[PDB]
Design a protein around this ligand. Sequence first.
Ligand code: HEM
Ligand SMILES: CC#CCO[C@@H]1C[C@@H]2[C@H](CC[C@]3(C)C(=O)CC[C@@H]23)[C@@]2(C)C=CC(=O)C=C12
Length: 452
Amino acid sequence: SSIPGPGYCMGIGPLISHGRFLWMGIGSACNYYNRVYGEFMRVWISGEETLIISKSSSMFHIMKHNHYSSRFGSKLGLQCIGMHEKGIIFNNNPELWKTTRPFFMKALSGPGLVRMVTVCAESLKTHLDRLEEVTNESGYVDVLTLLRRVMLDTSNTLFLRIPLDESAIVVKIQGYFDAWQALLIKPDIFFKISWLYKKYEKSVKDLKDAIEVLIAEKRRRISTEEKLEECMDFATELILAEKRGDLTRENVNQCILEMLIAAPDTMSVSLFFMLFLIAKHPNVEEAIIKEIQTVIGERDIKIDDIQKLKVMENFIYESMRYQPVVDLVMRKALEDDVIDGYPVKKGTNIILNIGRMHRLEFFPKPNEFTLENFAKNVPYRYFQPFGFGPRGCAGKYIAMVMMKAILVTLLRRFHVKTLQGQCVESIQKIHDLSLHPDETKNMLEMIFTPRN
Ligand code: HEM
Ligand SMILES: CC#CCO[C@@H]1C[C@@H]2[C@H](CC[C@]3(C)C(=O)CC[C@@H]23)[C@@]2(C)C=CC(=O)C=C12
């Protein structure tokens, strides 16, 4: 069929398009190029050719097959934040990624997902008898920060369990993301002129140095053991594998960082959106509270319960569909293939625009937020909010729990209000790596007026 896209104006194309991404934001550039051209088209980030697809069929083909299990980005930028052949999130070494994913995959399922539902509860309760830490004089709560802390506290108690200063680590995790996001696709010229990224180089060191202190104490606590396999958290599983010879110490320290930042990074921003959604849809928030009484009463939340919270389940899915945080997935082709009649050479970067695809395909009322879109059991081949196949979200299951749980325990106890005219749509957003609130603008606060 040959590939839709802008002109390769003899080396001018690649410069305008890359340049567009840097000015626009990886997020919006895709939403732009999809709109103007096809729902499948070619652009250039650095030299390398790169597809951007919002066709459900292409999307599904990609995430399904094993020869797409790699992402992409500046080898200089990934090296700088420490994810260059080290993490899993952006680990592009297919063998070295292959042997690391199992560790995440194990810790984020089975007994840990059972532990989580209650670890999430107790770790949110603690912080809700502590609003003094987050609340304005005028009653305004700093929802974002609150969430990040309970998210990081949750991640700690499950995967690492070593005493730390939430307050301080959160600000650092932010700096790390800020940097990661800044450097993911900066062209190499950028890295020569060094006084131009020293900020980002210092935000990385901050978090890394703060965590090397944490893993150092975690190592002591295993070398003086109360009989080993009694308490096998993610962090240990790794350290024990290192002291076999499967992982580099360096490689371990990244997974433990990548395992910590993940939830605060994304769950906080996601739940925050769902909160401006519950606060502007009274019809919905009533359905949820009733469902919570029907199923739980004022008992504690337990694993057996989560399947029953069906209306909330549809709320999370509809909030993620209508107002996503992770709206695009970056993959890369490893073997050549034809996909939807188009040829795609190995080495071709891919950006799946799942955020646009959730408005162009399947759904009945795509452009309005309604629990109506999920009244008819969604095929999952038309709604991929986590991804799937050999490189889907590793947290994809645990997350669905944690949201359910922290949404329950919150709504269970507070009515939520949005300062003045504000709402998800009127909120000002940055559309770069993710799709998150612009934190330098204000009016992002909420008001937690009690209940019953
Ligand atoms: C609801 C919030 C979340 C959303 C929307 C989300 C979404 C995603 C998406 C779309 C991907 C890319 C998968 C693909 O390429 O198809 C991803 C990757 C990943 N996610 Fe999440 N995720 C969420 C929560 C979490 C949580 C709570 C964790 C663990 C703390 C987590 C851990 C990971 C990891 C480790 C990867 C990289 C997997 C790999 O490339 O090998 N995620 N996530
Ligand atoms: C604030 C905020 C936020 C959430 O988005 C980021 C970036 C995610 C990335 C997975 C791979 C993803 C989906 C990609 O392939 C491109 C963007 C990537 C994701 C979701 C995973 C963990 C994390 O800490 C941070 C993120």
